[PDB]
Design an enzyme around this catalytic site. Structure first.
Site, short mmCIF file in Angstrom:
data_model
loop_
_atom_site.label_atom_id
_atom_site.label_comp_id
_atom_site.label_asym_id
_atom_site.label_seq_id
_atom_site.Cartn_x
_atom_site.Cartn_y
_atom_site.Cartn_z
N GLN A 1 50.30 82.27 46.88
CA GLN A 1 51.23 83.24 46.33
C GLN A 1 50.88 84.71 46.50
O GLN A 1 51.78 85.55 46.53
CB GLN A 1 51.46 82.93 44.85
CG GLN A 1 51.98 81.53 44.63
CD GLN A 1 52.20 81.21 43.17
OE1 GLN A 1 51.31 80.70 42.49
NE2 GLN A 1 53.40 81.50 42.67
N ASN B 1 45.43 72.21 40.32
CA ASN B 1 46.42 72.87 39.49
C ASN B 1 47.56 71.93 39.12
O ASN B 1 48.07 71.20 39.98
CB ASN B 1 47.01 74.08 40.21
CG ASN B 1 48.02 74.81 39.37
OD1 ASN B 1 47.70 75.30 38.29
ND2 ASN B 1 49.27 74.85 39.83
N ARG C 1 54.05 70.75 28.25
CA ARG C 1 55.35 71.07 27.68
C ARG C 1 55.33 70.32 26.37
O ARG C 1 54.54 69.39 26.19
CB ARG C 1 56.51 70.46 28.48
CG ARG C 1 56.76 71.02 29.85
CD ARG C 1 57.95 70.31 30.48
NE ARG C 1 58.04 70.60 31.91
CZ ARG C 1 58.79 69.91 32.77
NH1 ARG C 1 59.52 68.89 32.35
NH2 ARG C 1 58.75 70.21 34.06
N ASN D 1 48.29 74.86 31.07
CA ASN D 1 49.36 75.80 31.41
C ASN D 1 50.51 75.43 30.48
O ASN D 1 50.76 74.25 30.26
CB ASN D 1 49.84 75.61 32.84
CG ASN D 1 48.84 76.06 33.87
OD1 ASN D 1 47.75 76.54 33.55
ND2 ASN D 1 49.21 75.93 35.14
N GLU E 1 47.69 79.43 32.10
CA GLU E 1 48.96 80.03 32.54
C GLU E 1 49.95 80.04 31.39
O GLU E 1 50.05 79.07 30.65
CB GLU E 1 49.61 79.25 33.70
CG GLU E 1 48.96 79.44 35.06
CD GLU E 1 49.71 78.73 36.17
OE1 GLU E 1 50.95 78.63 36.11
OE2 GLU E 1 49.05 78.28 37.13
N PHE F 1 56.67 79.73 44.02
CA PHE F 1 56.99 78.45 44.65
C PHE F 1 58.45 78.09 44.37
O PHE F 1 58.90 78.16 43.22
CB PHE F 1 56.07 77.35 44.13
CG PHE F 1 54.62 77.53 44.51
CD1 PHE F 1 54.22 77.36 45.83
CD2 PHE F 1 53.66 77.83 43.55
CE1 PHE F 1 52.88 77.50 46.19
CE2 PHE F 1 52.32 77.97 43.90
CZ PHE F 1 51.93 77.81 45.22
C1 LIG Z 1 54.13 77.22 38.33
C2 LIG Z 1 55.49 76.81 37.77
S1 LIG Z 1 55.59 75.00 37.73
C3 LIG Z 1 55.93 74.62 36.07
C4 LIG Z 1 56.29 75.61 34.99
C5 LIG Z 1 57.60 76.27 35.31
C6 LIG Z 1 57.74 77.64 35.17
C7 LIG Z 1 58.94 78.27 35.46
C8 LIG Z 1 60.03 77.51 35.89
C9 LIG Z 1 59.90 76.13 36.03
C10 LIG Z 1 58.69 75.52 35.75
N1 LIG Z 1 55.90 73.42 35.63
O1 LIG Z 1 55.56 72.50 36.67
S2 LIG Z 1 56.38 71.26 36.55
O2 LIG Z 1 56.23 70.84 35.14
O3 LIG Z 1 57.75 71.67 36.90
O4 LIG Z 1 55.77 70.32 37.51
#
Ligand SMILES: *CCS/C(Cc1ccccc1)=N\OS(=O)(=O)O
Ligand SMILES: *[C@@H]1O[C@H](CO)[C@@H](O[C@@H]2O[C@H](CO)[C@@H](O[C@@H]3O[C@H](CO[C@H]4O[C@H](CO)[C@@H](O)[C@H](O)[C@@H]4O)[C@@H](O)[C@H](O[C@H]4O[C@H](CO)[C@@H](O)[C@H](O)[C@@H]4O)[C@@H]3O[C@@H]3OC[C@@H](O)[C@H](O)[C@H]3O)[C@H](O)[C@H]2NC(C)=O)[C@H](O[C@@H]2O[C@@H](C)[C@@H](O)[C@@H](O)[C@@H]2O)[C@H]1NC(C)=O
Ligand SMILES: *[C@@H]1O[C@H](CO)[C@@H](O[C@@H]2O[C@H](CO)[C@@H](O[C@@H]3O[C@H](CO)[C@@H](O)[C@H](O)[C@@H]3O[C@@H]3OC[C@@H](O)[C@H](O)[C@H]3O)[C@H](O)[C@H]2NC(C)=O)[C@H](O[C@@H]2O[C@@H](C)[C@@H](O)[C@@H](O)[C@@H]2O)[C@H]1NC(C)=O
Ligand SMILES: *[C@@H]1O[C@H](CO)[C@@H](O[C@@H]2O[C@H](CO)[C@@H](O)[C@H](O)[C@H]2NC(C)=O)[C@H](O)[C@H]1NC(C)=O
Ligand SMILES: *[C@@H]1O[C@H](CO)[C@@H](O[C@@H]2O[C@H](CO)[C@@H](O)[C@H](O)[C@H]2NC(C)=O)[C@H](O)[C@H]1NC(C)=O
Ligand SMILES: CC(=O)N[C@@H]1[C@@H](O)[C@H](O)[C@@H](CO)O[C@H]1O
Ligand SMILES: *[C@@H]1O[C@H](CO)[C@@H](O)[C@H](O)[C@H]1NC(C)=O
Ligand SMILES: *[C@@H]1O[C@H](CO)[C@@H](O)[C@H](O)[C@H]1NC(C)=O
Ligand SMILES: *[C@@H]1O[C@H](CO)[C@@H](O)[C@H](O)[C@H]1NC(C)=O
Ligand SMILES: *[C@@H]1O[C@H](CO)[C@@H](O)[C@H](O)[C@H]1NC(C)=O
Ligand SMILES: *[C@@H]1O[C@H](CO)[C@@H](O)[C@H](O)[C@H]1NC(C)=O
Ligand SMILES: [Zn+2]
Length: 499
Positions: free
Chosen positions: A37, A184, A257, A326, A407, A463
């Protein structure tokens, strides 16, 4: 008694009420980034994110943007340190690009001494400014050669190659780096890279996405997840057996989450919510704390779920000194069918849950997190209390682990001009509301959290989104990426850290 806000408007942006002094004296505060990134391709070999973004430009981002040059941290790494210095940050999480130090993937093929020097300079610079490095070994940027030789994490050959790469990193940087992250967001590559094909390498079942070059969304995410756990565990074993003299710590990074029932009085929604915890968190935390996958996964996934041998189970169980957690958002969960026989079946369907940000009574879980222009009903919303719930859950369910929030952040539209992007009050609100709850959970539940690293030191390639969204606490002009100017959020964070 600590009280934290869950809805707008927030008042936690007042450093007189909330600041670093609210936390323990040794608590680490900083920001995070990743190699693909921020660095640019200059001086490194090609990895699967270069491959994916170039073969599937529409998937790299709506603007077809990629990490070719991005904010050019290869050239401007000193500017990154300057931002950290300005923030008086005590921690910085960055990742090492495997392709930069071992362009040919397999260590026996030779190393890139110049690439190794790049990280030596960065690490030396951070330490000289009193910034503790938290280094991610693998932030998804797998050398393309490995994906082409044996499809990367889809094959067990990845274990030894990752181990040799990690060994090189410990050997070269371990005397200075004392906090290591292996892979990660364990959940991400298996699901997004081998399930939905939203991420590199872009494999999936033919009917899930005809553009995928190969794949099986129903089986591959489990194979990849399994190999990730084994590769991670092999590296942790190597670190603790051959590098204990370095006096450092190592752990995996989990994307966390929280989950709430779409309908809190409906047993089916409640069950789907608990299944989500097991399928999202347990998929990796079960093996990490017990050497086995959650029973619900064993039962549901059946033959598609790999088994750990007694030796592998022992290797994976307890394979961490700490957990890099994160956290971004929380979702409501409701039941959803799991059509295992359908050609479009994905591993993500095994949880038997549909995720939303609005519950049965029409309640949006919290403030806007990300606006989806393609579809309004696809907007993401955040939930500050989620970080409290996640930390509490990890302490009580996963044996009171040492945790570092690796994060936490929010994006703002890429369409905004310089002035609008700089006045990122929505980011201050997001960061402070989560920090309030983090302080609250540490004090009320005694969760062993010792650090917090906000996502994106600056704006970079995101990403799947190219440059259509900005996550930085510092602004970067894409016409002249040299400067890293602190936004309102960066300025607030500076005051939060040093009130
Ligand atoms: C590095 C972002 S991946 C993530 C958290 C996220 C942030 C913003 C928008 C959408 C997702 N979570 O990864 S995952 O749970 O989607 O695999
Ligand atoms: C933390 O790890 C612990 C292990 O270190 C977990 O405990 C294990 O839980 C296993 C269930 O997942 C359990 O294994 C089952 O054992 C059944 C009985 O086997 C004995 O008796 C048989 C008599 O006929 C004999 O033949 C066997 O040799 C044993 O002596 C067995 O019937 C089960 O097999 C069926 O179900 C599995 C699915 O679970 C199918 O895969 C299988 O084809 C068959 O349909 C099962 O055996 C396992 O089968 C798969 C095979 O690959 C495994 O090698 C084989 O073990 C096991 O006995 C215990 N072990 C211990 C030490 O208690 C623990 O799980 C939790 O707690 C247990 C008690 C249970 O409640 C689980 O549901 C819980 O998840 C893990 N804890 C957590 C938090 O996950
Ligand atoms: C959160 O979940 C709860 C529990 O599932 C919801 O409450 C349930 O809502 C059902 C309607 O969707 C109720 O069933 C209906 O009951 C009436 C009256 O007898 C009947 O005429 C209907 O045919 C239907 O009956 C079911 O029909 C299907 C059969 O398989 C089943 O056995 C029958 O019961 C159900 O009684 C009710 N449960 C309870 C204990 O309240 C809840 O739904 C919300 O509240 C209910 C009371 C009602 O006002 C709904 O319109 C309203 O959406 C749900 N909450 C939300 C916001 O969705
Ligand atoms: C993904 O791989 C799985 C496993 O190889 C495929 O599922 C098998 O499909 C065959 C043909 O219907 C069945 O005979 C097997 O019993 C299935 N295995 C199990 C236990 O699931 C699946 O079809 C593949 N998906 C795609 C789209 O290629
Ligand atoms: C959807 O979420 C809302 C907000 O959390 C829930 O509403 C709360 O419900 C509790 C219990 O009945 C009340 O004590 C609160 O006063 C309600 N808060 C608000 C803002 O109304 C609601 O119950 C949820 N809906 C479902 C079906 O789970
Ligand atoms: C509709 C659209 O614009 N998206 C296409 C997608 O349908 C196609 O499968 C892919 C091939 O790589 O190229 C994308 O640009
Ligand atoms: C930091 O916040 C605390 C409340 O948690 C407050 O008492 C203190 O005065 C603040 N520090 C400064 C210098 O504003
Ligand atoms: C530690 O390093 C030695 C020397 O290279 C090696 O023989 C041994 O297998 C390593 N231990 C591991 C793999 O953890
Ligand atoms: C195929 O999968 C999609 C996405 O889950 C779903 O919307 C569609 O209904 C499925 N088609 C079939 C075979 O039912
Ligand atoms: C690019 O930005 C740097 C730092 O602000 C500045 O010194 C340089 O003159 C700029 N170059 C351009 C595009 O003129
Ligand atoms: C940086 O933080 C340290 C420790 O709290 C403090 O002593 C120092 O004054 C701060 N420096 C600045 C300029 O904020
Ligand atoms: Zn290019």
């Amino acid at each position: 008694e600590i009280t934290c806000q869950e809805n707008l408007p927030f008042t936690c942006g007042n450093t007189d009420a909330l600041n670093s002094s609210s936390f323990s004296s040794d608590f680490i505060f900083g920001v995070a980034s990743s190699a693909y990134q921020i660095e640019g391709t200059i001086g490194r070999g090609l990895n699967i994110w270069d491959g994916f973004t170039h073969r599937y430009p529409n998937k790299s981002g709506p603007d077809h943007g990629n990490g070719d040059t991005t904010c050019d941290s290869f050239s401007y790494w000193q500017k990154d340190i300057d931002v950290l210095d300005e923030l008086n940050a005590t921690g910085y999480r960055f990742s090492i690009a495997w392709s930069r130090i071992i362009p040919r993937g397999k260590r026996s093929r030779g190393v890139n001494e110049k690439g190794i020097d790049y990280y030596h300079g960065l690490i030396s610079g951070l330490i000289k400014k009193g910034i503790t490095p938290f280094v991610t070994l693998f932030h998804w940027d797998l050398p393309q050669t490995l994906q082409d030789e044996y499809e990367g994490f889809l094959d067990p050959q990845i274990i030894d190659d990752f181990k040799d790469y990690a060994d090189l990193c410990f050997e070269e940087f371990g005397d200075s780096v004392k906090y290591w992250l292996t892979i990660n967001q364990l959940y991400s590559v298996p699901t997004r890279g081998y399930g939905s094909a939203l991420d590199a390498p872009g494999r999936c079942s033919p009917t899930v996405d005809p553009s995928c070059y190969a794949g099986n969304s129903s089986t591959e995410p489990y194979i990849v997840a399994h190999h990730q756990l084994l590769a991670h565990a092999k590296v942790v074993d190597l670190y603790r057996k051959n590098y204990t003299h370095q006096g450092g710590k190592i752990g995996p990074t989990m994307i966390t989450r929280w989950f709430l029932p779409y309908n809190d009085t409906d047993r089916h929604s409640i069950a789907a919510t608990e299944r989500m915890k097991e399928f999202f968190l347990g998929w990796f935390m079960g093996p990490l704390t017990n050497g086995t996958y959650p029973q619900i996964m064993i039962d549901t996934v059946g033959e598609r779920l790999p088994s750990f041998s007694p030796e592998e189970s022992n290797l994976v169980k307890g394979s961490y000194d700490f957990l890099g957690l994160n956290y971004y958002f929380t979702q409501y969960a409701q039941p959803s069918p799991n059509p295992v026989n359908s050609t479009n079946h994905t591993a993500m369907m095994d949880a038997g849950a549909k995720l939303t940000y609005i519950n049965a009574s029409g309640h949006y879980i919290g403030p806007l997190f990300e606006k989806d222009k393609a579809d309004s009903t696809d907007n993401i919303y955040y939930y500050p209390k989620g970080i409290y719930s996640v930390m509490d859950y990890f302490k009580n369910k996963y044996y009171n682990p040492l945790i570092y929030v690796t994060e936490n952040g929010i994006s703002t539209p890429g369409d905004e001009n310089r002035n609008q992007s700089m006045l990122d009050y929505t980011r201050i609100d997001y960061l402070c509301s989560h920090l309030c709850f983090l302080n609250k959970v540490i004090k009320e539940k005694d969760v062993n959290v010792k650090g917090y690293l906000a996502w994106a030191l600056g704006d970079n390639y995101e990403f799947n989104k190219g440059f259509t969204v900005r996550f930085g606490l510092s602004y970067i002009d894409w016409n002249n990426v040299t400067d890293r100017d602190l936004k309102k959020s960066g300025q607030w964070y500076q005051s939060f850290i040093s009130p």
